[PDB]
Write a protein that binds this ligand. Structure first.
Ligand SMILES: O=C(O)CC[C@@H](O)C(=O)O
Ligand SMILES: O=C(O)CC[C@@H](O)C(=O)O
Ligand SMILES: [Fe+2]
Ligand SMILES: [Fe+2]
Lengths: 349, 349
């Protein structure tokens, strides 16, 4: 039966890997949250494996196990970073829930009836370690998540490690894919259980895991109709409106047909998250703090000639463009919805 | 009660006018078809009346009773035209119903599952008079409607009358409104009872009545949501999908809120039909053949600066543009609908 076969290939992250030296299972199923949709595993390969180069070339996710991309950072931890990252400001988000929904502050002007579930708070690294230390011993329920792009104000040793990254490998990837420039490197340090809701980015991304384990659930661009992203002008643009913990099938019927690709990444693994691919990221339950550094690259330039059929991500690009134009033409983003409905009601639906 | 007051101002074409010389009522209520919506009267004024100049300036319909625009043509009739219009080809549409829905043949390629309710048949004027004579005596049910733009192949006397038109008046109108060039002059000769379904044009129009009487029902551009025009790429683009004789309130709920402006025009009257205004035109029942000549003018150029709020017709222009672009981008007009739905479902509705 194809039914049974389907219930099998939907193995998710599969059997937990064993850490060398018989140090036991990296993690166990109970550390993963439970969702209503099925998921197939993302291929875990060697960077020397042609299949991996094949997946990246075809804009498909793949976990590279031996790139040594951020090898020098694998020694990183709270103590080390505090004594070497510098005294610059670090964006720290606090929240009353395990979900850290991303919001664009420049767009909070278009929607005043919008209040974020998490607030940003700038501070020095030692302060973050402090606020965190407080909560851990105070037994608080508050959750924190540090997300700061690595700037030119970081300490000497941190700059040293940075230089030790495997630029030879990634620079060749950048070149072979025709991608644009490296736009930034985001350092992420979250508490166990933390979750970054499903969303997509308009950048190519090499997601390098350093400390702790993270479960990454991706969805191809062609599942746009099942994930219902917020309006382009809304502050939560590119994020999914669907609450994965309590799906509202009445407002989002097609979320019942969603099928993901998941995997659990650990120290040393690099996950290629293709541009426009949706991704849900959560730090395993009771797994301790997690550390990650991403590498965002501008996508390759759109080809002078346009071949048909268009790819899923090209249609997503068109929809985004329409929403943006209409917002400018109407002189007000709030009127985008009414005009769109007027356009389709009784005409295209 | 505002209810009663509303039921009063909704007088439609009002009391039938009396023809000079005590020749009786021009027409009577029983010659008008019955519809499910209410209608207020269009102002019937003198071209010297400032109020008329006011309405035209504000892009609002008005019937001018004394322009003498097509004074020389008032003598026109089948016999005269046959002996003077020439031997060029005249587009003649035949149909099994009283409704002559307009269709764009260049767009019949995008929709193959579309078959017009009326067919075009080129012929010489004398042939049209023939086919018509046949039906009238044969007691046939077939209906004909001649619609041919006046070209440079018309007879001498017809050209004479043409020259006698009141160009002094209309040329000043064209100049005062900043309108573009005169694009064409359509000659319409239909059988009693004929109907041109509700639709709008992207041209300014001076509709000059010559023979017989016509009931014209207009709807302002802001009633777009109540009239459900076909998709822009469909051959019936700009026409209403709503069957005025048997409205489908299930597919077109807002047609229940539609409110029109009507009037009955006769020999000598000129009806200004502003650009984008919907219009329904029917030749009175048992009123004999009708003759009309319109004057289509390119609208004025869009102002360099755009003031807000936009006017209803500007939003209609934006919607049309979106449909067109999307059709080009997707490489196929048939995919416009699916993409639009994907865009709004669970996001803007
Ligand atoms: O690790 C996370 O919490 C999410 C990061 C992800 O959105 C990215 O683009 O790197
Ligand atoms: O007279 C008619 O049948 C309709 C003509 C009208 O659509 C016009 O644009 O002049
Ligand atoms: Fe992301
Ligand atoms: Fe028309």
């Amino acid at each position: 039966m194809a039914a049974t076969a389907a219930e099998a290939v939907a193995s998710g992250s599969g059997e937990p890997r064993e850490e060398a030296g018989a140090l036991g299972p990296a993690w166990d199923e109970s550390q993963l949250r439970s969702y209503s949709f099925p998921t197939r595993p993302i291929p875990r390969l060697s960077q020397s494996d042609p299949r991996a180069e094949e997946l990246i070339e075809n804009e498909e996710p793949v976990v590279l196990t031996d790139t040594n991309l951020v090898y020098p950072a694998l020694k990183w931890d709270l103590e080390y970073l505090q004594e070497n990252i510098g005294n610059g400001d670090f964006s720290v988000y606090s929240a009353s829930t395990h979900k850290f929904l991303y919001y664009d502050e420049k767009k909070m002007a278009n929607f005043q009836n919008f209040k974020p579930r998490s607030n940003r708070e700038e501070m020095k690294f030692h302060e973050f370690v402090e606020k965190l230390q407080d909560i851990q011993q105070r037994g608080g329920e508050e959750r924190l998540y540090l997300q700061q792009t690595l700037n030119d104000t970081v300490g000497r040793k941190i700059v040293m490690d940075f230089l030790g990254f495997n630029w030879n490998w990634i620079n060749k990837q950048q070149g072979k894919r025709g991608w644009g420039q490296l736009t930034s490197n985001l350092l992420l340090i979250g508490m166990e259980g933390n979750v970054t809701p499903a969303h997509y980015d308009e950048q190519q991304n090499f997601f390098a895991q350093i400390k702790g384990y993270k479960r990454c659930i991706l969805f191809p661009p062609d599942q746009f109709e099942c994930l219902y992203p917020y309006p382009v002008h809304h502050p939560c643009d590119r994020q999914s409106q669907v609450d994965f913990d309590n799906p509202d099938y009445e407002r989002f019927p097609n979320f019942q047909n969603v099928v993901g690709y998941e995997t659990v990444v650990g120290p040393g693994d690099v996950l290629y998250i293709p541009m426009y691919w949706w991704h849900h990221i959560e730090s395993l339950l009771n797994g301790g703090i997690t550390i990650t550094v991403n590498f965002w690259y501008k996508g390759a330039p759109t080809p002078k000639r346009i071949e048909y059929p268009l790819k899923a991500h090209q249609k997503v690009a068109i929809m985004r463009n329409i929403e943006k134009m209409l917002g400018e033409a109407l002189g007000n983003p709030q009127e985008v919805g009414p005009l769109l409905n007027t356009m389709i009601k009784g005409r295209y639906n």
